[PDB]
């Protein structure tokens, strides 16, 4: 009896003073992350099991992906200057009610008093698990007085894909970030946390595409609405503006038609000035021209600064030529831009994009056909 | 990747005009089967659907689903519209791999504006 | 006590250094695939069980297809230059909640690295 | 601060538009621990019973005990 007591005391002292361990249950999502990380780190895992991800895509598409996990039992891993025991015990006693699997857990067992190794391993596992996912932008529509997830998540459009001016987009992005990351400044002074922006310009400037691109770069959601339609009313507009989801930039178009004339001109600004709002209420208004509008709309508590999108410039033309054609003579791009400017002065980016579509993978032909465009 | 790098919508359109009885629809189904892609047929010559309905259904088309339309002559000659269909086709709202095919008897009633980038890319005639 | 400790250390060293294994649970869809593949590869499977696929097609059509699976227990297969042990253990402890079947798994056990 | 034996639990939230927000938290590992508080040394026993599972939650029965000398 004395030997057993001495052994128990020695073991408990050893564990409490010289030994470190970490446990992850099967219910926790970190279980799969740690299993995948340990599989990736150790290439020569002789004992292992397999799991397949099977997806039945439409029209009878079988998509099966094979993945490998360490087999249940004991493993030894050499990490840092330490040898760590990994115990994957699948308990043969009971089954999880939520999932329908026998109780499982994993344990990392190491010698020393340096818990930072476990923290670093866990952070690396989190990073590896997160790096596979690709960010997506979800489109939202408005029906009646309700926002709906319309369509499917959209791939985020890169910022450099859309070019507007030398630094206008940079200024807009900087102002948006400054407004977003400083809510304390607004709440301390007791001012509503809302912002409005106005983009008036010739059609074909890709204003909506630029809005989607900046929403993707900011990772914020976008909710488009066509106020020029008579289906919605002033009160419906007020409700949908107020019921907009979190971090959801709301985009509106064609202010000229409604402001000229359900249809209203001061009702929209009254609804915009309403106290009922949401966290980070950003509204963008895209239109062809500003002539039909009034300075009252461009005011604090409303559209803050006005930005105008222009036609293609020499810098814009050479930047879009470089973006389309991956690596050529810069002098060729300069000559292309000069010829385009000589031929036309009100050239829009949409026309240039269509022209480049007409001459896909044909740089020299497009250069020689500028006079054809005239 | 080539399309997304240049910032161009990932959509394509094809036109097959020819005499009736050439099996254009059968060939469309056969190529859809070989590509294993799904097919969604629509008769735009009917007046049941409108321009806005056409825009919604074009935009809400499922993934890898080639959309087939027939009888452009009747609608373009005249719910019924001739430029509304091309406006809906040019709409930004689309899906991943949005391929549209248009089968018809003849091209006389149509216009060169329909055969353009961002629209039907190359014209093929069945003999 | 020393003999038990020595045997345990020898066994764990043997498994960790010289022995390879793979496990497939019954929940995973690869279970049926591997069972069918092992049935097809080995024609002379003396111990086996049967499963029928019964379909009631319209107008009273009975379509029954018979398939054969290795019986639960131990089997030996000669593949490549290796003799592999196959253990189909149907655990008589608990029943799967999702499906309504007792817990099952299959194991492939082979010598080498 | 120096809890050598510990386990980890993450709070994972799927915010709209595919926002992954994962927060890591650390709990003492099941077993025996000793804490020095006030003028006392208190034993903490976190026993996770391997007999039955809670019906309401779906977790094995667990409890924690603080054990101290004095009145």
Residue numbers in the entry:
A (entry chain E): 30 to 290, 306 to 418
B (entry chain F): 213 to 290, 306 to 354
C (entry chain F): 30 to 142
D (entry chain D): 72 to 142
Please share excerpts from the published article on this structure.
The human AAA-ATPase Bcs1L translocates the fully assembled Rieske iron-sulfur protein (ISP) precursor across the mitochondrial inner membrane, enabling respiratory Complex III assembly. Bcs1L is a membrane-bound oligomer, with each subunit consisting of an N-terminal TM segment, a middle Bcs1-specific domain, and a C-terminal AAA domain that is highly distinct, forming a clade of its own in the broad AAA protein family. Here, we captured Bcs1L conformations by cryo-EM during active ATP hydrolysis in the presence or absence of ISP substrate. In contrast to the threading mechanism widely employed by AAA proteins in substrate translocation, subunits of Bcs1L alternate uniformly between ATP and ADP conformations without detectable intermediates that have different, co-existing nucleotide states, indicating that the subunits act in concert.
Inspections of the model built into the map confirmed that the separations between neighboring subunits in the AAA domains are not uniform. This asymmetry is also reflected in the rms deviation of 1.222 Å for 2,259 residues when the C1 model is superposed to the C7 model, which is rather large compared to those identically calculated with the ATP- and ADP-bound structures of 0.285 Å and 0.248 Å, respectively. The apparent weak AAA domain association of mBcs1L subunits in the apo state is supported by the calculated buried surface area (BSA) between pairs of neighboring subunits, with lower BSA indicating weaker associations. In particular, the BSA between subunits A and G is the smallest at 4317 Å2.
